[PDB]
């Protein structure tokens, strides 16, 4: 159950928790993508940075 | 108008579940807003220090909020 | 309309946000005036509206004023620079939120009652409508 997260909006103007959640997820720049195991922590991060990312269930 | 006094930095210093050493101050307060429990002294100005090493525990003792140390 | 006593002569301005949660329906009379906007209604405005209703009906009926101006507002002297102590109280004001019923009226004639309530509404610094007791 892996999720594919892609950064869509920029980090400029983002708040501290949002920037740090993006860093924890591992996204560097816009249009960058990572694959993460779906669980409670991952969904918490995605919830915090929902407006800056788009998430689709890629395998 | 215009006068004031210094802020006294009152309140809880160690919270529930925290590991403390003997003598650690736990609650600075005026009067007994909290009450000493097992292994907890009071102090000359209601200071609620720890008499033993352990973990903090807040409770109820028939109306009084109490702070106790479990070893 | 002035309180006999207050515990604090100088108070912060009442906060003008949200919808009124209490006194939103007619309780005493069968006709009422319901506010639709926030304002600081003063005792002078209240007296004006009350006299308007009374002097239009001219006889019969009962009028209730379910608001009291017990919040004071201060004002500094006219010719003074900025910031040399808070000013002395000048006005007495009631904090009104949308949905709050201001006046209550009962009268045998619906047309005359509605005309008097409209006359009252046109004296207040708010948009207000007329609601019945269903």
């Amino acid at each position: 159950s892996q999720l594919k997260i892609t950064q869509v909006r920029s980090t400029i103007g983002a708040r501290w928790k949002q920037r740090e959640s993006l860093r924890t997820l591992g996204l560097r720049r816009i249009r960058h993508s990572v694959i993460r195991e779906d669980n409670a922590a991952t969904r918490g991060l995605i919830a915090v940075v929902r407006h800056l990312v788009e998430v689709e269930p890629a395998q | 108008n215009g006068r004031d006094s210094a802020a006294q930095r009152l309140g809880v210093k160690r919270y529930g579940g925290q590991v403390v050493k003997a003598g650690e101050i736990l609650v600075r307060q005026r009067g007994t807003k909290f009450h000493p429990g097992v292994n907890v002294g009071r102090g000359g100005d209601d200071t609620l220090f720890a008499k033993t090493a352990g973990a903090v525990e807040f409770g109820i003792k028939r109306g009084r909020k109490t702070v106790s140390i479990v070893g | 309309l002035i309180p006999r006593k207050v515990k604090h002569r100088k108070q912060h301005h009442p906060r003008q946000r949200g919808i009124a949660s209490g006194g939103t329906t007619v309780n005493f009379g069968d006709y009422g005036i319901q506010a639709l906007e926030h304002a600081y209604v003063t005792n002078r405005q209240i007296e004006s509206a009350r006299i308007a209703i009374n002097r239009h009906i001219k006889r019969g009926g009962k009028v209730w004023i379910n608001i009291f101006p017990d919040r004071p507002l201060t004002k500094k002297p006219a010719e003074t620079r900025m910031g040399s102590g808070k000013g002395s109280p000048e006005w007495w004001v009631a904090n009104v939120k949308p949905g709050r019923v201001l006046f209550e009226l009962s009268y045998p004639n619906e047309g005359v009652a509605r005309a008097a309530l409209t006359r009252a509404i046109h004296k207040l610094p708010i948009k207000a409508r007329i609601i019945t007791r269903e």
Binding site: - | - | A20, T25, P98, G99
Partner: protein, 95 residues
């Protein structure tokens, strides 16, 4: 007498209530002697018309989507501004 076409609320909450009110229904609950509450959806216009015609204490022979059981209105929540019904409290009655 006062027949009502109600359905069980699939989802409850702030957003669900807002969506139902926008769609034109009235969220409600049904409790009483059975010590068990149910969340039902009441169509707005017909329920309001029933309330106007037959009064507040009118017996409501509403039937669940599959079952029939009459009840009574215990309390209604009316918006101060819109003066419409947001919520209904229906109490079962043992005749």
């Amino acid at each position: 007498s006062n027949q009502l076409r109600v359905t069980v609320r699939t989802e409850t909450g702030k957003g669900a209530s807002r969506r139902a009110r926008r769609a034109g229904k009235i969220p409600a609950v049904l409790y009483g002697h059975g010590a068990e509450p149910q969340h039902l959806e009441l169509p707005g216009h017909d329920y309001a018309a029933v309330l106007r015609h037959s009064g507040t204490n009118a017996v409501l022979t509403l039937d669940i989507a599959g079952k029939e059981q009459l009840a009574l209105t215990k309390a209604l929540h009316i918006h101060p501004i819109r003066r419409t019904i947001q919520h209904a409290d229906l109490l079962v009655v043992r005749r």
